[PDB]
Amino acid sequence: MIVKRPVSASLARAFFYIVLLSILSTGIALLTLASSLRDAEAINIAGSLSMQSYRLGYDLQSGSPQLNAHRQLFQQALHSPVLTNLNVWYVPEAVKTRYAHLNANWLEMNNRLSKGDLPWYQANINNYVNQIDLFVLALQHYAERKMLLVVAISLAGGIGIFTLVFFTLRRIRHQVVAPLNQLVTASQRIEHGQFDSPPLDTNLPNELGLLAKTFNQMSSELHKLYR
Amino acid sequence: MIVKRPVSASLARAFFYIVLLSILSTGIALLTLASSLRDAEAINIAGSLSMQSYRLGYDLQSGSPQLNAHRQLFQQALHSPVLTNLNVWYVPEAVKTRYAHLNANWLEMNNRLSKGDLPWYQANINNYVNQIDLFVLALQHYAERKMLLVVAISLAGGIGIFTLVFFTLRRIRHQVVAPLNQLVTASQRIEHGQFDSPPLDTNLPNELGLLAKTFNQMSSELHKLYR
């Protein structure tokens, strides 16, 4: 007789998938989360462009001496590390295309401000800032989709591990634990002149199926000897 | 003889902790994530207050007919659902205390704007908006701490499940799989007149420790009979 389906191989497999599913879930989540750590910063800084843009016009109307320093504070913000890092493959094209528009708009805005053209500012500042808000809204939606992705993965991971464990434990109980108990009981009985108990089920394709067959034959011979 | 440590109870326990750790991790993460879904929105809207505040001053300087509609657009934003939901127990006191300051500042700002007091606006708008930025920065840091919490949990969860599985599989192999193989080999040997092989180790406190003892006695008697 032979064991066609060893428990060692079955168990190895069962646990492998439990881990795999854990590593996968955890991995995607951590990779997503890692890409998101500075989302709130990006949205903050991006949003500040809106305010800086209207401040500039307020500076211009009031002849503020801070105009030039504010024009340089915008440029630094616009080209901040957090925003320049947006030009990366996993960031949606829309977010990158809008950022490029903002950079082009600034060149005209900053030029007009150097000439002190107030009438042009008053005629364009609404549209100018609208494009900035649509960029902030883009970052917001992007940050939301990524967080939702983590929720889906976290949920499927947990549900997936709960499901695997259920069936894995259900298989071990049916194919190992229960039969083992039947072997122990039969063994304890045979050891005490109890020989007329239901023979052991031998239909399992694993080690316990073989043990049952050997026991059914080590037992049946005794009963006959005595008996 | 008896089984002092059944495999059924040992396994139940092992898998229980694997699930528990999965449910716990997943649960805290999903609860944190659920509280964070609108973080990016809050930061966006909060940041827009900064811009709306300077626009109002720009309106005032240019005698814009939109002044009153913008004064009403700020109030709606300031009291938006996303910001009013901040007054909840799990939100840090700082974020709630700053929001309360913004609401008080608005009452004075909106009043001065109704009187058309430009000189007061010019003298206060810097400080006014600074408090708004510190509120946005507070929301940003809050959103960052919560995301980091999810990273810690996700990491510990994955590492925790990988660790549990390792030792759980290592215990089953040492206490079930290996001995089972020894029982099968001995059984296959005894079945073919091989009687001088090393007796089975009987030191396990589980079912297999008992089976070994019964086998060592069902075997030893045969060898003597024949042999």
Numbering used by the authors:
A (entry chain A), B (entry chain A): 1 to 227
From the paper:
Among the best studied TCSs are the nitrate/nitrite-sensing systems NarX-NarL and NarQ-NarP, responsible for the regulation of anaerobic respiration. NarX phosphorylates NarL in the presence of nitrate and dephosphorylates NarL in its absence; NarQ phosphorylates both NarL and NarP in the presence of nitrate or nitrite and dephosphorylates both proteins in the absence of ligands. Both NarQ and NarX consist of seven domains: a four-helical periplasmic sensor domain, TM bundle, HAMP domain, so-called signaling helix, GAF-like domain, dimerization and histidine phosphotransfer domain, and, finally, catalytic kinase domain. Whereas the sequence identity between NarQ and NarX is ~28%, their ligand binding sites—membrane-proximal parts of the sensor domain’s helices H1 called P boxes—are very well conserved: 14 out of 15 amino acids (residues 42–56 in NarQ) are identical, and the differing ones, Ile45 in NarQ and Lys49 in NarX, are responsible for the differentiation between nitrate and nitrite.
Previous studies of NarX showed that replacing the arginine residue (Arg54, corresponding to Arg50 in NarQ) that coordinates the bound nitrate with lysine or serine resulted in loss of ligand sensitivity and locking of the receptor in the phosphatase state. The crystals diffracted to ~2.0 Å, however the diffraction was anisotropic, and the final dataset was processed to the resolution of 3.3, 2.4, and 2.2 Å along the reciprocal lattice vectors. The crystals belonged to the same space group as the ligand-bound symmetric WT protein, F222. We solved the phase problem using molecular replacement with the structure of the ligand-bound WT sensor-TM-HAMP fragment as a search model. Surprisingly, the backbone of the R50S mutant has the same structure as the ligand-bound WT fragment, despite the Arg→Ser mutation and absence of nitrate in the ligand-binding site. In particular, there is a break in the α-helical structure between TM1 and the helix H1 of the sensor domain, whereas TM2 and the sensor domain helix H4 form a continuous α-helix. A hydrogen bond between Ser50 and Asp133 is observed in the crystal structure of the R50S mutant but not in the MD simulations. We conclude that the crystal structure of the R50S is partially artefactual, and the protein is trapped in the ligand-bound-like conformation by crystallization conditions or crystal contacts.
